[PDB]
Amino acid sequence: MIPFNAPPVVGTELDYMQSAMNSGKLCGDGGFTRRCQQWMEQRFGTAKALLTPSCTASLEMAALLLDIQPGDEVIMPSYTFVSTANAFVLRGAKIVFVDIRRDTMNIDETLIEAAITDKTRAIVPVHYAGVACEMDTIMAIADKYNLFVVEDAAQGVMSTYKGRALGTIGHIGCFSFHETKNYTAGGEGGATLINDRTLVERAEIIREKGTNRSQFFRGLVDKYTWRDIGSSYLMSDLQAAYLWAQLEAAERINQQRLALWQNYYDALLPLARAGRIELPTVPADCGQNAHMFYIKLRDIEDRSRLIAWLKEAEILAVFHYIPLHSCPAGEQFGEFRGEDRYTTQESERLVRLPLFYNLSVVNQRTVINSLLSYFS
């Protein structure tokens, strides 16, 4: 049985976790947390990297960091994971959905400005499949209207846009280390990346349960106190040690996934040039991370038939997002501005193929040959 995903395994995780257990300090903000956060700061360039329990928690932390208030409007795609919306609705935001581009399934940057109102406070681009949104256009829009930009870079660890690491471009960026993403912190995890230097101090306060604890450890105050509403956005140092093993192998993993990605593209390009399917687009300025390999079929019937075909060959391929805006909570918490030209239509024909670090070359060729048989 060929699964859709298997978590990355590097072969050093156990050793690093054992080392963490030898230190006797497994709670958050430990030695391996510092190592991972320093690595992201050094290699990606953010002002502060902060490990969290999940990308969901990182997104919630960003909404709280931005002091989102009831009635504030947050612009985001409808074609994204539910947590992108929840994080802001939890702070009372109304969600303003904007259609996606057909070529990359990312929010259409040429549609964001038309959705801005005097209540708009932030824009949340989602880098679908590790392919960056058109960030220069989005930052220019946000600066013209004095909006925060929050990157949902859950799928974009090691991705770049014009040489810049995804997650370091907006004011705040969020990573996911769930076992289905490129790197995993032992099953679950996330990171908030603070790129606006004026937000670092507040980020440290809300992450530390609303206290100026980090400021006390720095020696700037005699004692710390409860000074704001906060939460606990901490990863265990056990999970940070698992993550470190993976981050130490960051390029190894990235290069393996990219090579696998390119075998899919080579094999399926003829079916695309014949117009039977559509393959992913990777715009010139975008350095992808092979988070997924998706294809688009004619419609949901074509998609369903291919998935059930692959299932009968014991290959697990899956579709992705259902548009948030036409879900019951989406109609309650948000509105879709402008026409839904591509969000529903394109979501209904997209299928994702098995892709993961340890996917064998033999299993991959089995997937390819089953696909070719279906279209033959």
CB environment 138-171: b (16+ within 10 A), e (fewer): bbebbeeeebbbbbbbbbbbbbbbeebbbbbbbb
- Judged by beta carbon, residue 242 or residue 264, the one nearer Cl ion is 264
Q: How far is the CB of 298 from Cl ion (least distance, A)?
A: 6
Q: How far is the CB of 294 from Cl ion (least distance, A)?
A: 12
240: nearest Cα among 26, 30, 32: 32
Distance of CA 66 to CAs 91, 335, 346, Å? 10, 21, 32
278 touches Cl ion by CB under 5 A: yes
72 touches Cl ion by CB under 5 A: no
SS3 call for 79: coil
With CB atoms as reference, the residue minimizing the distance to Cl ion is 366
Of the residues 162, 181, 209, 223, only one is catalytic, namely 181
User: Which range touches Cl ion (CB under 5 A), out of 179-187, 305-313, 314-322, 361-369?
Assistant: 361-369
Whether 223 is a known active-site residue: answer no
Distance of CA 266 to CAs 214, 258, 277, 362, 364, Å? 51, 12, 14, 16, 13
The residues facing 334 across adjacent strands are 95
Site for Cl ion in 138-167 (CB under 5 A): 146
- Judged by beta carbon, residue 146 or residue 376, the one nearer Cl ion is 146
369 touches Cl ion by CB under 5 A: yes
CB environment 49-65: b (16+ within 10 A), e (fewer): bbbbbbbbbbbbbbbbb
332 touches Cl ion by CB under 5 A: no
Binding residues for Cl ion, how many (CB under 5 A)?
4
Which residue from 231, 304, 363, 366 is in contact with Cl ion, where contact means CB under 5 A? 366
User: Which range touches Cl ion (CB under 5 A), out of 21-29, 209-217, 255-263, 364-372?
Assistant: 364-372
Q: How far is the CB of 171 from Cl ion (least distance, A)?
A: 7
Can you give the binding site for Cl ion, defined by CB under 5 A? 146, 278, 366, 369
By annotation, the residues acting in catalysis are 181
